[PDB]
Amino acid sequence: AVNVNTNVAAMTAQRYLTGATNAQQTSMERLSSGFKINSAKDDAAGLQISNRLN
Amino acid sequence: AVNVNTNVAAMTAQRYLTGATNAQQTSMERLSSGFKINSAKDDAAGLQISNRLN
Protein backbone atom coordinates (compact mmCIF):
# COMPACT_ATOMS: atom_id res chain seq x y z
CA ALA A 1 0.00 0.00 0.00
CA VAL A 2 2.75 2.50 1.01
CA ASN A 3 4.99 2.74 -2.09
CA VAL A 4 8.56 3.57 -0.94
CA ASN A 5 9.23 3.67 -4.72
CA THR A 6 7.16 6.87 -5.31
CA ASN A 7 5.98 9.72 -3.00
CA VAL A 8 3.24 11.79 -4.74
CA ALA A 9 2.91 14.15 -1.74
CA ALA A 10 6.60 15.08 -2.12
CA MET A 11 6.07 16.01 -5.80
CA THR A 12 2.94 18.02 -4.84
CA ALA A 13 4.82 19.99 -2.14
CA GLN A 14 7.62 20.79 -4.63
CA ARG A 15 5.14 22.01 -7.28
CA TYR A 16 3.70 24.57 -4.82
CA LEU A 17 7.21 25.25 -3.42
CA THR A 18 8.58 26.04 -6.91
CA GLY A 19 5.60 28.34 -7.49
CA ALA A 20 6.26 30.14 -4.19
CA THR A 21 10.00 30.47 -4.93
CA ASN A 22 9.31 32.15 -8.31
CA ALA A 23 6.65 34.37 -6.70
CA GLN A 24 9.25 35.54 -4.14
CA GLN A 25 11.86 36.02 -6.92
CA THR A 26 9.37 38.17 -8.92
CA SER A 27 8.40 40.28 -5.87
CA MET A 28 12.10 40.71 -4.90
CA GLU A 29 13.01 41.97 -8.41
CA ARG A 30 10.09 44.45 -8.44
CA LEU A 31 10.96 45.87 -4.99
CA SER A 32 14.68 46.18 -5.97
CA SER A 33 14.02 47.83 -9.38
CA GLY A 34 10.93 49.81 -8.33
CA PHE A 35 9.22 48.91 -11.64
CA LYS A 36 6.16 46.60 -11.83
CA ILE A 37 6.88 45.99 -15.56
CA ASN A 38 10.49 44.75 -15.13
CA SER A 39 10.29 42.43 -18.19
CA ALA A 40 7.92 41.75 -21.12
CA LYS A 41 6.75 38.61 -19.23
CA ASP A 42 4.40 40.92 -17.24
CA ASP A 43 2.08 43.66 -18.64
CA ALA A 44 3.54 43.37 -22.17
CA ALA A 45 0.75 45.76 -23.26
CA GLY A 46 1.85 48.10 -20.45
CA LEU A 47 5.48 47.88 -21.64
CA GLN A 48 4.53 49.35 -25.04
CA ILE A 49 2.32 52.07 -23.48
CA SER A 50 4.93 52.83 -20.79
CA ASN A 51 7.76 53.04 -23.37
CA ARG A 52 5.71 55.49 -25.49
CA LEU A 53 4.94 57.51 -22.33
CA ASN A 54 8.59 57.36 -21.18
CA ALA B 1 0.90 54.50 -3.40
CA VAL B 2 4.50 54.28 -2.08
CA ASN B 3 6.15 54.10 -5.55
CA VAL B 4 9.67 55.61 -5.20
CA ASN B 5 10.63 55.51 -8.91
CA THR B 6 8.40 58.61 -9.37
CA ASN B 7 7.32 61.65 -7.30
CA VAL B 8 4.67 63.81 -9.07
CA ALA B 9 4.26 65.86 -5.87
CA ALA B 10 7.92 66.98 -6.14
CA MET B 11 7.54 67.87 -9.85
CA THR B 12 4.47 69.96 -8.92
CA ALA B 13 6.24 72.01 -6.22
CA GLN B 14 9.25 72.40 -8.57
CA ARG B 15 6.96 73.85 -11.30
CA TYR B 16 5.22 76.27 -8.88
CA LEU B 17 8.65 77.15 -7.43
CA THR B 18 10.09 77.95 -10.90
CA GLY B 19 7.05 80.14 -11.56
CA ALA B 20 7.50 82.12 -8.33
CA THR B 21 11.30 82.43 -8.80
CA ASN B 22 10.86 83.81 -12.34
CA ALA B 23 8.35 86.36 -10.97
CA GLN B 24 10.93 87.47 -8.37
CA GLN B 25 13.50 88.07 -11.15
CA THR B 26 10.95 90.15 -13.10
CA SER B 27 9.96 92.24 -10.05
CA MET B 28 13.64 92.75 -9.09
CA GLU B 29 14.51 93.96 -12.63
CA ARG B 30 11.46 96.28 -12.58
CA LEU B 31 12.30 97.71 -9.13
CA SER B 32 16.03 98.06 -10.03
CA SER B 33 15.58 99.97 -13.33
CA GLY B 34 12.28 101.58 -12.25
CA PHE B 35 10.99 100.85 -15.78
CA LYS B 36 8.01 98.45 -15.93
CA ILE B 37 8.69 97.80 -19.66
CA ASN B 38 12.32 96.56 -19.42
CA SER B 39 11.66 94.56 -22.63
CA ALA B 40 8.96 94.19 -25.33
CA LYS B 41 8.12 90.80 -23.73
CA ASP B 42 6.62 92.98 -20.95
CA ASP B 43 4.28 94.96 -23.29
CA ALA B 44 4.88 95.38 -27.06
CA ALA B 45 2.37 98.24 -27.45
CA GLY B 46 3.73 100.07 -24.39
CA LEU B 47 7.33 99.78 -25.61
CA GLN B 48 6.49 101.25 -29.05
CA ILE B 49 4.24 104.03 -27.69
CA SER B 50 6.79 104.89 -24.96
CA ASN B 51 9.71 104.74 -27.43
CA ARG B 52 7.82 107.19 -29.69
CA LEU B 53 6.66 109.25 -26.65
CA ASN B 54 10.24 109.38 -25.25
How many whole angstroms separate alpha carbon B25 and alpha carbon B22? Answer: 5
Nearest Cα of chain B lies from the Cα of A18 at a distance, in angstroms, of 28
Q: What resolution in angstrom units was achieved for this structure?
A: 2.5
Asked whether the beta carbons of B19 and B12 are under 8 A apart, the reply is no
How many whole angstroms separate alpha carbon B42 and alpha carbon B45? Answer: 9
How many whole angstroms separate alpha carbon B51 and alpha carbon B54? Answer: 5
Neighbours of A50 (CB within 10 A): 13
Asked whether the beta carbons of A34 and B4 are under 8 A apart, the reply is yes
B2: chain A residues, CB-CB within 8 Å: none
B3: chain A residues, CB-CB within 8 Å: 34
Method: cryo-EM
How many whole angstroms separate alpha carbon A46 and alpha carbon A52? Answer: 10
A35: chain B residues, CB-CB within 8 Å: 5
DSSP, residue by residue, A27-50:
HHHHHHH--S--STTS-HHHHHHH
Neighbours of B25 (CB within 10 A): 9
- Which phi and psi angles does A31 have, rounded to 5°? -55, -45
